[PDB]
Design a protein around this ligand. Structure first.
Ligand SMILES: Nc1nc2c(ncn2[C@@H]2O[C@H](COP(=O)(O)OP(=O)(O)O)[C@@H](O)[C@H]2O)c(=O)[nH]1
Ligand SMILES: Nc1nc2c(ncn2[C@@H]2O[C@H](COP(=O)(O)OP(=O)(O)O)[C@@H](O)[C@H]2O)c(=O)[nH]1
Ligand SMILES: Nc1nc2c(ncn2[C@@H]2O[C@H](COP(=O)(O)OP(=O)(O)O)[C@@H](O)[C@H]2O)c(=O)[nH]1
Ligand SMILES: [Cl-]
Ligand SMILES: [Cl-]
Ligand SMILES: [Cl-]
Ligand SMILES: [Cl-]
Ligand SMILES: [Cl-]
Ligand SMILES: [Cl-]
Ligand SMILES: [Cl-]
Ligand SMILES: [Cl-]
Ligand SMILES: [Cl-]
Ligand SMILES: [Cl-]
Ligand SMILES: [Cl-]
Ligand SMILES: [Cl-]
Ligand SMILES: [Mg+2]
Ligand SMILES: [Mg+2]
Ligand SMILES: [Mg+2]
Lengths: 154, 154, 154, 156, 156, 156
């Protein structure tokens, strides 16, 4: 049931100084950070990441948004991590996101793009693809978090 | 899409020392405080604010409640601020409010009135009316919050 | 409307150092701690507490889980405390729990048992029974919390 | 008695950065009572009056520009030895020197031509009295019970 | 070894104000282990025994009234040099003098006839030993692993 | 100018305990800018190079074992007098001595054969320069605006 998912702490979150608060929510949930780095995405990489939206009217604005400033890309590992992180993220448009979710508590204002604090892979398949776009195997680690032993079935 | 809504941090919140925590939730969401002051509402002003409830059985108790101690009235500005703040507030009766919402996390106990931490305008129209009841134009301001520039479409 | 409910801060929460954070959520909601103690539940007591699950496939694992390390048993008092605490706890399986709830924010990983941070009585009847299992009348108290006077109808 | 009132100004840097709530919560958590509060936009005349004791100091101009840059939140805190206590909570004038745990220590660092330091706290009972009068009318200050006030009642 | 056990009492003011959780979290976050804990309502005999060293001091009576005002939460914290560490976390006896960041510094200020100061922390290993015995039976103290205990294992 | 860059390492104890976010938030809240950051697993060669000044010290071996125990998060913080400021935020080397409010003061205590102390902070501008180079390539460090940067613009 253990899966890996890719999360991008977007430019709006970085500029607003919310990196730590976002990371803490994942750590507190029990999710493990197995990879992470601050990078500045270029248009080519951005369009590959968001290839599914190439023919949508907001594509250009979305690429401008994700490449506006550096972002923090990270890989989270844990039981059903993909669906869990999507649940934690909340609705795409922050105004519709429920209080308690990341977008619900931190997002609201938008530009030409629907600024929404973070990106979260939408499926195990997508996560695999996205993780490969931003990380090399040598940047992903296997190590124990403090409470790992507690759940070991002997 | 930018709107203004009126919020009243009720006597129960003031007495319990929750003013700051409530304000922080709005600031963290990205909402801008364009007006704010601690006042002690008298019955006349209270009945004008809650005119819609004049013929309800809980009217008297509600007026007693809102005028019990000083309150903090404030105007919040932001994208769809009215519906967003209502969403953040949660169900009228705190016991029914979802965890994560203001009433959900802070409210529960009631008196003869359903004490519920805060008041939030229910519509743009109501907000306009309520804002006018408590504030003069000279008490409302236009200024930039730190991240405002980020969302400017050039 | 004032009720008492039993909550058990389970071994996973104790080991992870989440006792305080869990307690704070209840205090902030307005709930009153009328009884509380750290104990180490033995199998006999554990099976009495979870008697309803005796014929379920996960029974053995559940008993192992709840008796793994000491836990903190506590009695919470307040308006509709039973349903309110259940609401605050969230879905049984933490991966399904909504962000904002205790299980939603803190739980995810599981062992042979569905580790979910806390236990909360499912009804007033169950609460009565469970409270009696862990506490003697002399361990339960009646005292005023700071804001109690605020809600007194004269 | 030991109960005093002091003036706090949540400065433009704090307002712009969205720290109003976090600052207020620190005072509420300490047990201090907010007896008056409002968001205002200080004009140069009022700013220079508040900081008149620095009228003949080199940093005066930058200070006025800073305090009047955007709206601020002025408030009056009441409580046991509130003046010295709030000053202690504020921390060293230059935030880089302020101890972690203090308001300036946890939230301040960067400066403009002025030493931006998150908040203002009256330095003495005499200054508190003068400052409260500059920003608040008696009609804007209130006497009411905070939840735990009854717990501290002395004598019988 | 360096591992010690100390006694902490979350006093009536903290309980009434709903600060039990916040106080416990500070100890958990520090890495201290809670090996015993319970809510009890201290009677005068036990209160006077705990504070026997102040038996002949003017504030004694007010102190007993205060500590027995409502139920409290007594707990035993275990960890490296726990006695001095918890004392440091507590801060100065009179909360108005306690540094921001400490428990008394962030949460205490107001007083009654007694100097209400949020919590009690054993002042020495000798006092800790005596105090733990007054409130806890060995059967109420436990040895178990906290999540990160394995990380600190020494030697091979 | 007064703007400096310093190197911070969120050590294995912090990573294992899930404190990465809380530590980063303290720097963000202070107003410091993260210009570089990544999770890496330090090897003995790099660890010994970073701590070369302790090459001939008794605790060296335990120190290397500790810093290479699990992955860490290295990051570069930029801001006014960042070196001394971050050091101040970190607190005393041995967490038991660190003041409440500091990172080590609030989060550290227990030790292994090494004095586990949550994070590493460059001790000087010279050390910061050397350390940043050991862990980061210029291509991994960025210049960008944080939300409030405009507020502090000096002069006209
Ligand atoms: N301007 C604009 N941007 C959008 C819209 N929908 C989505 N976006 C942006 O494009 C991103 C990706 O879209 P999508 O995958 O559908 O949403 P997500 O998976 O929840 O992030 C969203 O997170 C927004 O940043 C839209 O309708 N208009
Ligand atoms: N006693 C009592 N008070 C109520 C009841 N419904 C609402 N109230 C109080 O009256 C306030 C205004 O009512 P309403 O506008 O319907 O709810 P709101 O807009 O969510 O605050 C509520 O916030 C409560 O303070 C009720 O059924 N009984
Ligand atoms: N292994 C396993 N454990 C379960 C399952 N369902 C429940 N549990 C565990 O048994 C406890 C009690 O079950 P139940 O009363 O139905 O859920 P609760 O009232 O929400 O705690 C749950 O909290 C879990 O700890 C399950 O389907 N499989
Ligand atoms: Cl949502
Ligand atoms: Cl963990
Ligand atoms: Cl709701
Ligand atoms: Cl902002
Ligand atoms: Cl749920
Ligand atoms: Cl209360
Ligand atoms: Cl200081
Ligand atoms: Cl209070
Ligand atoms: Cl101190
Ligand atoms: Cl731990
Ligand atoms: Cl220190
Ligand atoms: Cl910023
Ligand atoms: Mg998507
Ligand atoms: Mg209404
Ligand atoms: Mg059940």
């Amino acid at each position: 049931e253990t899966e890996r998912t890719l999360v991008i702490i977007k430019p709006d979150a970085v500029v607003r100084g919310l990196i730590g608060e976002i990371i803490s929510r994942f750590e507190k949930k029990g999710l493990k950070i197995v990879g992470m780095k601050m990078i500045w995405i270029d248009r080519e990489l951005a369009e590959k990441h968001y290839e599914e939206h190439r023919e949508k009217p907001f594509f250009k604005a979305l690429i401008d948004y994700i490449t506006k400033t550096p972002v923090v890309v990270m890989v989270l590992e844990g039981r059903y991590a993909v669906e869990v992180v999507r649940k934690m993220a909340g609705a795409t448009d922050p105004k519709d996101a429920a209080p308690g979710t990341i977008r619900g508590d931190f997002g609201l204002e938008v530009s030409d793009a629907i600024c929404n604090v973070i990106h979260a892979s939408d499926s195990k398949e997508s996560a695999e693809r996205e993780i490969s776009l931003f990380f090399k195997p040598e940047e992903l680690f296997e190590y124990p978090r403090a409470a790992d032993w507690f759940y070991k079935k002997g």
